[PDB]
Design a protein around this ligand. Sequence first.
Ligand SMILES: CCCCCCCC/C=C/CCCCCCCC(=O)OC[C@H](COP(=O)(O)OCC[N+](C)(C)C)OC(=O)CCCCCCC/C=C/CCCCCCCC
Ligand SMILES: CCCCCCCC/C=C\CCCCCCCC(=O)OC[C@H](COP(=O)(O)OCC[N+](C)(C)C)OC(=O)CCCCCCC/C=C\CCCCCCCC
Ligand SMILES: CC(C)CCC[C@@H](C)[C@H]1CC[C@H]2[C@@H]3CC=C4C[C@@H](O)CC[C@]4(C)[C@H]3CC[C@]12C
Ligand SMILES: CC(C)CCC[C@@H](C)[C@H]1CC[C@H]2[C@@H]3CC=C4C[C@@H](O)CC[C@]4(C)[C@H]3CC[C@]12C
Ligand SMILES: *[C@@H]1O[C@H](CO)[C@@H](O)[C@H](O)[C@H]1NC(C)=O
Ligand code: ALF
Ligand SMILES: [K+]
Ligand SMILES: [K+]
Ligand SMILES: [Mg+2]
Lengths: 986, 277
Amino acid sequence: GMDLDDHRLSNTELEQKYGTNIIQGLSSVRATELLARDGPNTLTPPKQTPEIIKFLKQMVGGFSILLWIGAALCWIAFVIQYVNNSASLDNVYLGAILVLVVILTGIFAYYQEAKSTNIMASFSKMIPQQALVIRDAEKKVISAEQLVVGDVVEIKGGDQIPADIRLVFSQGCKVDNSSLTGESEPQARSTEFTHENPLETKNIGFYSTTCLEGTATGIVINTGDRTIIGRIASLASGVGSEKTPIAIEIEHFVHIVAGVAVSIGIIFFITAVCMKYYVLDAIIFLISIIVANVPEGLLATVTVTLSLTAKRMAKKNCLVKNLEAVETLGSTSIICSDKTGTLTQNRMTVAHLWFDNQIFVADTSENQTKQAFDQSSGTWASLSKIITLCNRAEFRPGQESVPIMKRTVVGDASETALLKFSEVILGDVMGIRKRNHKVAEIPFNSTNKFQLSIHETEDPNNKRFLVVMKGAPERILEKCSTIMINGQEQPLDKSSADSFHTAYMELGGLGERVLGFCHLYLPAEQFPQSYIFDVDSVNFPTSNFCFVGLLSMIDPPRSTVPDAVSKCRSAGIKVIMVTGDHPITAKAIAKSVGIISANNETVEDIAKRRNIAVEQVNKREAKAAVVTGMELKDMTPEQLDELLTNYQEIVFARTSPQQKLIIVEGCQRQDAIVAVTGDGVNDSPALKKADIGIAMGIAGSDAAKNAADMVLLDDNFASIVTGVEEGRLIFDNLKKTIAYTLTANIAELCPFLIYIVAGLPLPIGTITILFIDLGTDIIPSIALAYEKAESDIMNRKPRHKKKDRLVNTQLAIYSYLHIGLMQALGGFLVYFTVYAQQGFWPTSLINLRVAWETDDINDLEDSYGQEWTRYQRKYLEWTGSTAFFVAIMIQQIADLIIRKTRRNSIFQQGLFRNKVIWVGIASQVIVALILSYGLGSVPALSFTMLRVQYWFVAVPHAILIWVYDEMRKLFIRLYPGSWWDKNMYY
Amino acid sequence: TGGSWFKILLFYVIFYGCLAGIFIGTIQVMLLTISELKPTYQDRVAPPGLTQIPQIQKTEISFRPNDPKSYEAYVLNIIRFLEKYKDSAQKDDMIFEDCGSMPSEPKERGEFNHERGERKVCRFKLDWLGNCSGLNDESYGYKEGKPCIIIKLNRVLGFKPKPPKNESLETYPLTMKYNPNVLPVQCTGKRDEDKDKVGNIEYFGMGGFYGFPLQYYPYYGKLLQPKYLQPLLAVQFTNLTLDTEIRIECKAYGENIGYSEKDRFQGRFDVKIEVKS
Ligand SMILES: CCCCCCCC/C=C/CCCCCCCC(=O)OC[C@H](COP(=O)(O)OCC[N+](C)(C)C)OC(=O)CCCCCCC/C=C/CCCCCCCC
Ligand SMILES: CCCCCCCC/C=C\CCCCCCCC(=O)OC[C@H](COP(=O)(O)OCC[N+](C)(C)C)OC(=O)CCCCCCC/C=C\CCCCCCCC
Ligand SMILES: CC(C)CCC[C@@H](C)[C@H]1CC[C@H]2[C@@H]3CC=C4C[C@@H](O)CC[C@]4(C)[C@H]3CC[C@]12C
Ligand SMILES: CC(C)CCC[C@@H](C)[C@H]1CC[C@H]2[C@@H]3CC=C4C[C@@H](O)CC[C@]4(C)[C@H]3CC[C@]12C
Ligand SMILES: *[C@@H]1O[C@H](CO)[C@@H](O)[C@H](O)[C@H]1NC(C)=O
Ligand code: ALF
Ligand SMILES: [K+]
Ligand SMILES: [K+]
Ligand SMILES: [Mg+2]
């Protein structure tokens, strides 16, 4: 409802506005009235449509409307026949089969469709139950849902904030805002208006976040869905009712096929009416047109191939929640990627350490066990003992089995990072810490800005007190007067200070937090081994230390992220970085993972290098762009569009959860399919808005996993690369399968048009072609989904979502007007062969069907003068139909062989390399054998047993199909861009 | 562009012309196999069907003798069929021959070849169809309660019917058989109810024999034997119950003759006759 915050207001005006008091809180008689007026502090669940309605919507999706019309026409034809006593139950069987086809395709489509899951349950780990509010000047432990605006609530370290509160009294309060920024770094809270942005003003406590430590008092300012997390969840749930690109392509293909069917139906219905035909023949012919023109089994096979690829991917730790998401990778133009936890290990580790005036680099992998950076020299043993001695962090016991880098440790980020580094390089560091009995004085403070500790060395011959003090590099330098170089305590001069400052600047220029380390050997003469120390700093020196080194921590990228980003960019995909972290760290991570290339520069970098101002330099030289949330919030959509178009390497830093969604929407309006990778609650609206959203398994939140279309169960971007490859392969194989099915559609359609025009006896029945659709052509179409790539999948650019369709005009015309007609010709050759060998020459069959189908005539005369009864005529008609069916099967075997490739040849692709195609060929042959010599041994469903020679009459036509396709692809290969690749390639 | 349109029309005209040429070439190569004298196979026609002349709609003959319009269609169909059996039509001696008036052996006229050209055909006289030739009674028996149907065996090229042997008494004896060279035909009510209302059926065949004489077989197939006349057997139901619909089944008998439950006209009739008062 309201989207503004009130943090510029002090206690008095807030009390006047919200009508409350800090001390007395609110009276219950007013608290309950306000609660009734506004509502409980609860998140409203979305409106989930019933599953039955979704299941029923699939019965009118795709080609189901045409099949329902066909079933209705079958019922009407059956009743017309029943009135006139000439009924054979064949239309009832056709209608029942069509209804069954609709039911099965609807079931498969329901399974394919993305499941709508609510996101409220993913916020249950947040959203506390009990709140410490004060009413009528006494504190009461009332539930969170009973809060209302104006109430005064206290928070304690370790609990969840009961609502969006504005702090009034705070005592060293720290909060974790990982749900708003994706960064778990503890944020200091106070009562001071610090920043213009409400999300970063340090005196606002947010609903569903956790208070790490301290104690704070505040006034509730937002309740329920009016809170930050409330709008985050509202965006995550409400938005996202869009179709996947493969769904759009399938819908376009269905539109093309339905248009063809309807146009031919109207035209040939007019031709039938004009040729003096009554109603029954016209409606039966329209039924035949519908049954021939609709691919009855194609969509279910599409779903089966999608599920096969989904389970193959799931075998590699890549969980596909939504089946259609297996294709969205591939045809993806832009990847908008979160940084922390997604491109980054979300672990704070040491990267660089500077000592002996030299900068050494340490390995930052999550599996590294030992690292070498010239440790044999001096000045490093002292540094390592400073790391161990001046470190408070402790492992949790019982973690011997788990490796070092995965061990859970108590402490802050820097303390744990130093502990992990020491435990890695030095080995067992608990024993060394145990040896030197540390004095109870270990002063650390948010204001002192240094960590101090005094230890006594356990060397048997030395037994000398050694003090260690670490902290911020400037506070470190001002508290020292010498430096350690090769073990010599050389005094720190002006040049040494300048070199230290240069190293500090270089380390800070990589987005690394830097710590200083120094020590001093307290003399035994003034500090014997019988001296007691006081925490009041009244008996030990806090100055004149010996500087040693400078370590820095980075929160580094994952091991397999840089090369995966490189492969994704080499596949033509733009990789955009959208993170809630600070700009410096974001830019450093982008350069480390290759999102911003080393050669490329940003406007600020160029201006600094040229010693000029940012305004002076034009912006065409800089190929990179780092954009903060403040800069983007003022940008109009036009400026955002120009920013996306002009720059190829873009980094958006310090972005709110709504700003990620805005960036995604800006990318999508560029006619692009965009993928979002995330692992946090703040990424959920962007994940749900994206065409495909990818979450991380180990590092991901429940909300991110629920909002995503895909989950990386092992946190590897190589899964993203393999998903792109698999999606592009799926697109190619879908093209092949669709062409293979359309060919059979036309091969089925042509006999009925010839039957209406020339007047021949029915070349093939309508029931027979249903066995083509749901019989011999089910397993070959699945087998075509197992084809390997004909070229480099990754070298190709992403396809344009508008200019590159799954089914284009070339595919449809080549399947309809080239290969389907050839199959019809072969079938008609076999049909005329069957009829002529029994007595009817081809010209005697023209305009014969009216007398042929007349039950009155039982002495119809053939070409030799013999007389035929009606049953013998219909048996010969069934035999011709069965021969036509077998011919279509043989030419579909040839079609299966030629559709194996779109440019290559079977000599190059390999005829026997894909064994699933040979399984499918065996399926075609076996199904035809069962339907001819099984069902057909008894005459049923217009099937009969054929003579052996009728199985091979159409073989040369199949060879001709193969030769024609081989020649087409050979000449496509020889002369690219020669009117032939443009007019004959699909 | 215009050049692209010209090329894409020329490709399609050439492609479709090539496809049509290949199709017609395959059809001609196939047709080279078959002959104009005899069919390659007789898997369907070999057991001949039995059909009647009036060519009725729903296996029903229904007429009122008072109204000539009721039986006019039946009579006209019989006239149309028998127009070629007139003595005027079979006058020539070059094409027709005066075959013996008593039943004889099947008359082989050589094997199926273009040699000897047009074969000769035996002539069939309407006089053998007494009460049903139409020579004396132009309306056959429809004016009275005497419906007349004419039975004919379906022409099958090179088919020689072999009459049933004396292994068993196939039905109630005809007592005038000449079984070596006569193919018997018997009409009886399908049910016991019809057998009590069918009446006295009088057959009319060549030589006074109740069936098809064998000197008309084999048939040589509309090329060697045009104007061939198949033998006929007139059947008349003199006394049948009025206003009742009687079911009649007529069968042919022989070793070579076969019957099918699926095909109701393979060697059998199922005709329904009613005569309204
Ligand atoms: C997309 C759909 C594709 C499929 C289209 C199906 C088209 C359906 C049309 C059917 C009409 C008949 C077609 C076949 C014609 C065969 C010609 C023929 O021979 O018939 C047989 C008769 C008599 O034979 P016989 O006794 O001498 O043989 C005895 C054997 N022996 C010679 C050895 C002694 O001969 C004669 O009556 C010859 C005198 C009559 C000639 C009529 C010519 C009509 C031909 C039409 C063909 C059209 C092809 C269209 C292709 C389109 C491609 C896109
Ligand atoms: C006896 C009966 C026998 C019947 C046999 C079958 C006859 C029909 C067989 C094949 C025809 C299939 C036609 C499919 C056409 C799909 C049209 C289409 O939208 O496809 C998509 C792609 C790209 O489209 P886009 O992004 O540029 O469109 C954007 C325009 N927006 C935004 C308004 C959508 O199309 C492309 O690949 C670029 C090419 C687009 C060409 C426009 C469509 C006209 C092409 C063919 C129509 C005539 C075919 C020949 C008829 C033969 C009669 C015998
Ligand atoms: C000889 C006859 C059969 C040729 C008929 C050609 C017809 C069937 C083809 C040619 C062009 C095709 C159209 C091309 C473009 C569109 C727009 C799309 O949004 C829906 C499909 C639709 C509407 C197609 C329907 C089918 C179509 C009209
Ligand atoms: C049966 C014969 C005569 C039909 C003749 C008309 C045919 C050849 C013409 C008419 C319309 C034409 C199509 C119109 C649109 C396109 C889309 C384009 O991207 C490639 C060419 C293509 C695919 C044309 C191919 C040739 C075409 C199909
Ligand atoms: C039928 O033939 C018989 C015997 O020749 C004859 O007596 C009878 O008159 C004929 N029927 C009629 C009414 O023509
Ligand atoms: F994990 Al983030 F922005 F880097 F939500
Ligand atoms: K179909
Ligand atoms: K999504
Ligand atoms: Mg994250």
